[PDB]
Design an enzyme around this catalytic site. Structure first.
Site, PDB file in Angstrom:
ATOM      1  N   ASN A 211       0.881  -1.344   0.047  1.00 17.47           N
ATOM      2  CA  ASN A 211      -0.059  -0.050  -0.059  1.00 17.47           C
ATOM      3  C   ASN A 211       0.864   1.133   0.081  1.00 17.47           C
ATOM      4  O   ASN A 211       0.781   1.901  -0.965  1.00 17.47           O
ATOM      5  CB  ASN A 211      -0.939  -0.040   1.157  1.00 17.47           C
ATOM      6  CG  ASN A 211      -2.323  -0.464   0.919  1.00 17.47           C
ATOM      7  OD1 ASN A 211      -2.594  -0.592  -0.288  1.00 17.47           O
ATOM      8  ND2 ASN A 211      -3.120  -0.790   1.835  1.00 17.47           N
TER       9      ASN A 211
ATOM     10  N   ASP B 261       1.890  -7.693  12.381  1.00 15.11           N
ATOM     11  CA  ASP B 261       1.743  -8.054  10.966  1.00 15.11           C
ATOM     12  C   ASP B 261       2.671  -9.248  10.752  1.00 15.11           C
ATOM     13  O   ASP B 261       3.126  -9.637   9.248  1.00 15.11           O
ATOM     14  CB  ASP B 261       2.366  -6.714  10.254  1.00 15.11           C
ATOM     15  CG  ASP B 261       2.193  -6.880   8.865  1.00 15.11           C
ATOM     16  OD1 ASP B 261       3.114  -6.195   8.096  1.00 15.11           O
ATOM     17  OD2 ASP B 261       0.903  -7.119   8.483  1.00 15.11           O
TER      18      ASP B 261
END
Ligand code: 2TA
Length: 289
Positions: A17, A134
């Site tokens: 992203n 993550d």
């Protein structure tokens, strides 16, 4: 220490992203003796993303561990932005891709070696009060056939001094099939939520990244593929409150599925520590040998 004049682009290794990672050769003498490195840069260098990028550079500089990817330095172009993070380059790529390419040559004892290395690296992160947030086979990198490394720290946050969790709701879409229940409902991230995610990392490892056995595939077959948008998350929340879990991977010993389930405990204080998991995985490995 690095000059962008002498960083020379070879190819792109990954692009998400807010950032991307490129394979480059740092060749300050312009004679093809320089070393090949990995370079992370932002692709929408807003000021909020830039300050968070610099906390990430500072976090990675503060870590040295056999199972953490090595920081090398930073680089700036004219001005003090267009900032780039220089790291060591690992030749074998993501553990996700490495494992489905050698699935018929990597047995369970080898899977458990990777697992315990991930644990020791995660335990090192915790001693410094960092929350990875993550973790997935996607971000675990492979130096060689006997060494894996935790490979990206884009979402790693440092715990506040007073409290043992962190509340963050991010703009954008999150990987909600690795997230602990209290992270879905209250956006709380702790070392116990990282243990939940390490459980699904271990699940992935034993599915050998078979396409219909990915956690999103299995989870959204459990709630029905008809579910819409925001309702997706809500239905998963309800499935986890009723003790719906990912199934045992094909061929997975019942001992290793008991480790997976013990990390998927609804009670956040009742999940094992990373040091306990390393000892359990080291004994299962030593009895197999
Ligand atoms: C710091 C670092 C050091 N070495 C590597 N080695 C690497 C080597 C080969 C790779 O193959 C990717 C697959 N193909 C893509 C084109 C070439 C091959 C991928 C990674 N990657 C590194 N980082 C990295 C590379 C790709 C993706 C990721 S990430 O998914 O975990 N995080 C984001 C980049 C999305 C932020 C991280």
């Amino acid at each position: 220490q690095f000059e962008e004049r002498h960083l020379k682009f070879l190819q792109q290794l990954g692009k998400g992203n807010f950032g991307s990672v490129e394979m480059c050769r740092y060749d300050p003498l312009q004679d093809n003796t320089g070393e090949v490195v990995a370079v992370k840069k932002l692709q929408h260098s807003t000021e909020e993303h830039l300050r968070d990028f610099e906390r990430e550079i500072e976090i990675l500089k503060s870590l040295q561990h056999d199972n953490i990817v090595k920081y090398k330095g930073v680089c700036y172009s004219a001005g003090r932005r267009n900032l780039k993070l220089i790291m060591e380059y690992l030749p074998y790529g993501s553990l996700r891709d490495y494992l489905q390419k050698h699935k018929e040559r990597i047995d369970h004892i080898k899977l458990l070696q990777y697992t315990s290395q991930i644990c020791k690296g995660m335990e090192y992160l915790g001693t410094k009060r960092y929350i990875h947030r993550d973790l997935a086979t996607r971000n675990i990198l492979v130096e060689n056939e006997n060494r894996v490394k935790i490979g990206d720290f884009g979402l790693t946050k440092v715990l506040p001094q007073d409290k043992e969790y962190y509340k963050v709701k991010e703009p954008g879409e999150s990987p909600i099939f690795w997230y602990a229940p209290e992270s879905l409902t209250e956006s709380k991230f702790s070392v116990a939520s990282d243990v939940w995610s390490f459980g699904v990392v271990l699940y992935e490892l034993f599915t050998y990244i078979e396409k219909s056995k990915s956690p999103p595939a299995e989870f959204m077959r459990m709630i029905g593929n008809d579910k819409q948008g925001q309702m997706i998350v809500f239905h998963l929340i309800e499935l986890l409150k009723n003790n719906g879990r990912l199934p045992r991977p094909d061929g997975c010993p019942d001992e290793i599925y008991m480790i997976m389930t013990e990390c998927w405990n609804n009670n956040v204080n009742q999940r094992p520590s990373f040091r306990d998991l390393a000892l359990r995985v080291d004994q299962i490995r030593d009895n197999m040998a």
